[model samples]
Target: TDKLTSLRQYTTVVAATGDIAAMKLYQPQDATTNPSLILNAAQIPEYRKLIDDAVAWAKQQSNDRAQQIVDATDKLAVNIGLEILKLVPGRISTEVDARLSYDTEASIAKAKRLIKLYNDAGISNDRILIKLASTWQGIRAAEQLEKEGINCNLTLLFSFAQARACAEAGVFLISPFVGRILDWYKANTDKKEYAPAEDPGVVSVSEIYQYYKEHGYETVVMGASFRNIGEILELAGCDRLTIAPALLKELAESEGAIERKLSYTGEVKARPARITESEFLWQHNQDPMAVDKLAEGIRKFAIDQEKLEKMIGDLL
Candidate 1:
């Protein structure tokens, strides 16, 4: 058996791309899309119809030209999400604007707006997960949304503190970025190479997986942003994994003996207490890597979001 099939034995494989056509190849249980992924897809000629449809629909909904652009971007995101949903039988994670990552109220408002857009299109809430950055405010926002029956997928998470807070908030899923962690360490430490077992990115996800299992937190751990197939193989038994199409293709083509690297069935250890706003901030401050990456991630997403808006505006 190939590594892809073997890994699927223990985890739900999710495709992390905006290209609906490519999604058919991996047959991921779920699919995830961000502003950057969506932007990339929008530039493709075949996917232009989705954008044009959203733009046309937005123009019909409003007379104000500027509002049409805003509405079209949201519509475009949902349009892509709706298409992705048809391919995957499971949930699809749609993100809020990265600019609102720090505002609890705005994040909640935007999530509601996105969900309503999906709901209006006849998609149920159960099949959707609102993607938010794992900020102190983001966690609190997710906590509120969960109470109201809105599930969330916390993204850009880097520290154990972020995971701890997410679990405390009763989030539906948390995506601990594996490849980005490795990027940080490699650039900072001058390390030229790392084996799968010793990779900082792999180690981070493993530690989080073990903690969640030991504590028995229902918050699903889905490792994201994998740099290589080795990182994916290293966390074989994780609850889920969101991989790009390139890596997914590699796994399907390559044959290997894949071992289950992680599992959770043991005595519970003393779990850390639920963190508060101050504690969360302080803990984040203590971790230089987490702080740098979280900010950098938000900046990158926001930039892409702006670019997407421009695309819609130019077309309008």
Candidate 2:
């Protein structure tokens, strides 16, 4: 059999893109989407109906032109996620606007807004995961949302403090990115090449997975933003791995035996400590890679979200 078939025996596979074609091809248990993925979907003919439908709803709800554009943009994102949910049965990550990352109240409201859209579309809250950035504010928003029966996917996570805080806050999932970690390290470090095992991105996810298991954290560790299939192979048995269609295809085509690389049973008895705001800030600041990457990630998402807004604005 192939690498993907073997990998699935251990960890749940999630599609990084929400596209139906790839969703059907890989048949990943869960699926993820962001401004960029859904933005691209707007360019094609088949998906254009999503754009029209979202705008029509937005116009019906609001009389103000600006507000209509705003509502339509969110509607489009939810509409695309609604489409994705039909293909992937488990869950779909719907992102909060990246610009809301620093504002806890805004993030929380944005998540609820998206969740309400999903509810209106006849999807259960359980089938949706509100995606928030891994900032302190993001974590705080998630903490409250979880209590309200809203599970959050803490994303752009890059530090021990980020993951620890997420676990303590009882987040439903954390997508610790793999390729982005490697990107920052490759630019700064001396080494041009890293084997899959030694890859910084893989190392980051591995450590997070181990810590979660050791400390009895239930927050799922879904390794995300992969650079290559080798990185995926190295993290063979993470809680979940969100693979892009390109890498998923490689795994499907290549025949190989894969090993279970992470364990959920390496328990060390200990009490879970809630990381205070200052403590989370200090620990996260100490890790230069995490700090740099978090800001960079937010900026990237912000740009894409803005682009999406402009696209939807044109339609309105």
Candidate 3:
């Protein structure tokens, strides 16, 4: 059971299909469930009961108003988060509403509410990472949360600037979306193929990792949104990585020795890069791709949030 032993060290792979038994059995090291992932998984027949019960409970509380339903959906997401926490030994990242991505105060408020809900359920804030989109406002919200003993994982990161900002803010973790970067590269490049080491996703994270380690930033870098196992293996020694169960199984079956892919011990002297508020805003504005993509990701997630609200309303 060498394969199983390796899996145990890496943390258990988590699933969000709302099948309590399946999630408990999975026993992930840390679980991260987003609105879109939850929406997709909750559609399954096996998960229907939990969804229905959650909606019914929300209606009983709110009299089924549409706005209240959205709040209720958020609560349901928190409830699922707490349930995952019960099975896993590590943290569970619960995301805030994407619509508030650019509103620091609102994002912070929502994060606090989610934490309060989890605390009420007997889960501690230490076991939760308030997931937020990597916007300027979102990072600010994370800074506030970190001061209050709350950790955060900035998601949807694509550029070095975003990574640098998260590190400067002293956030606990960041999940750089690797597959999404590959998708953008393929669509924009003349040659639409990449080797494992040459993957844009791997390069993006590798550069960020070096920046964090060399500068003595304690913020963690977690590789996310991988298209294949090659990308995952390429980032073998990342602080943490969120992999789908299929890829997790593939890694388990592979016999190749897994060694550290990155380290900071032998680097030459490099000047520290300071990211000021104006500099970040200027960089973000200059990069049309980052600006457009970040906004698009937020909007798409917001739409999914709305859909979940409607579903809750109908069921409630």
Candidate 4:
């Protein structure tokens, strides 16, 4: 069997793109989309109909031009998610606007709206994961949402502090970006090459997995943003791996004995002190890679979100 099939024995493979056609090639348990993926999909001809349908619906519901565009953009996200849901039997993650990453109430409100959009279309809240940035405010928002039976996937998580706070908040899942962490270290350090076992990104996810498993945290750890198939192989036994189509294809075609790299059978470590707001802020600030990458990730998502809005605006 191929590595992809073998890896599925230990982890849930999540297709990390908005390309519905591509997702049909593999049996990913879940699918994830962000502003970037949605924007990318919007430019494709096959997916254009989904966007047009959303815009058409938005036009019928709202009289205000600006509101129509904003409403249509959200509709497009849920519509795309709905399409993905038909292809995969598991949950689909639809992200909140990256612009509201730092606002607790705004993020919570947008998440509710996104969930409502899906619910109105006949999808239950359990089959959806509202993605939010792993900011302090975002974690707080997720904590509140979780209590109300809304599941959340905390994204853009870079630091241990972010993971700790997410687990402490009783988040449903947290996506730690593996490839992006490696990119930051590669650009900053002088090292030219590293093995899969030694890759900084791989190391980060493994550490997070170990921590979560050791402490009995129920928050699922999904390693995302892989730069290469090797990174995916290194995290073979993660709770879940949200892989893009390119890497997923590579794994499916390559045959090898994929070994489990992480597991939790050791004694539980003492739980760290509870993370206060000031402590989380201080700890997140202390990690240079997390700080720089978190800001850059937010800015990139915001830029793509703006581009998507412009496209929707042009349609209206």
- Summed backbone clashes in each candidate are 0, 0, 2, 0
- Looking at model 4, the pairs that clash are none
Cα displacement (angstroms), candidate 3, residue 183, comes to 0.2
Instruction: Give Cα-based local distance difference scores for all models.
Output: 0.92, 0.89, 0.77, 0.91
Model 4 has an lDDT value of 0.91
Q: Count residue pairs with overlapping backbones in model 2.
A: 0
TM-scores of all candidate predictions against the true structure: 0.97, 0.98, 0.89, 0.98
- Highest lDDT, which number? 1
In candidate 3, residue 55 scores what lDDT?
A: 68
Tens digit of per-residue lDDT, candidate 1, span 165-283: 99988999999999999999989988869999999989998999998889878899999998888889989999999999899999999987688889877887776767788888898
Give the higher-TM-score candidate: 1 or 3: 1
Which segments of model 1 are wrong by more than 4 Å? 269-272
- Model 1, residue 252: displacement in angstroms? 0.8
Could you give candidate 4's per-residue lDDT for residues 197-272 as a string of tens digits?
A: 9998888888889989898889999999998888888787899999999988898899886898778889887788
What is candidate 4's CA lDDT for residue 12? 90
Which scores higher on lDDT, 1 or 2?
1
